[PDB]
Structure formats: structure tokens, C-alpha cells
Amino acid sequence: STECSNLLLQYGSFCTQLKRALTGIAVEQDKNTQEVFAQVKQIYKTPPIK
């Protein structure tokens, strides 16, 4: 709705900082997974003898 957007533009920059917070959380999740699992520099494998 255009009238709701025009009234919402009066409230400042709350949407931008909410988007910034959610973007920081979303980047931080990938950083967490990368710093937990990607600890080895090479992809090793087991020889076929067991």
C-alpha cells in the first residue's frame, strides 16, 4: 500500500538498522560454521585397505 509506505517514511531509519542487524546475524552464522568445520587445509582420504 502506497499510503502506508508514505506514512512509514516519517519514522526515520528503523528499517535500515533492522536490516543491518539481520545481515550481521546471517554473516555471523556462516562465520561460525566456517570456524568450526573448516579447520583442515587439505581434504585427506582413507586408503582402500581397512
Partner: protein, 49 residues
């Protein structure tokens, strides 16, 4: 994306590998400790005299 180079160690039940030399390596780690201190007055900010 590529996770890394493929490697296959030559495992055997009577084979070992022992280093014969070394390197001395210096690395760098950076950690934040403190941030900038702030102080806000309500009457000057909201109202302004």
C-alpha cells in the same frame, strides 16, 4: 567452491614418516579488548533546553 587440495596419505601397518628438519614460524593474532566509551544526556538530546 573448492574445500581444498585432495590428499591421500600412504598409510601402512609398518611404515612411519619422521621429520628431519624444521622451520620457526611467527603468526599474528588480533583481538579486540575495549570499545569507545559514551555518555548521553536525555534533556539535551530529546528536548534541547
Amino acid at each position: 567452491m573448492s574445500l581444498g587440495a585432495e590428499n591421500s596419505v600412504a598409510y601402512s601397518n609398518n611404515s612411519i614418516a619422521i621429520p628431519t628438519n624444521f622451520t620457526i614460524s611467527v603468526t599474528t593474532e588480533i583481538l579486540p579488548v575495549s570499545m569507545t566509551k559514551t555518555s548521553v544526556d536525555c534533556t539535551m538530546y530529546i528536548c534541547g533546553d
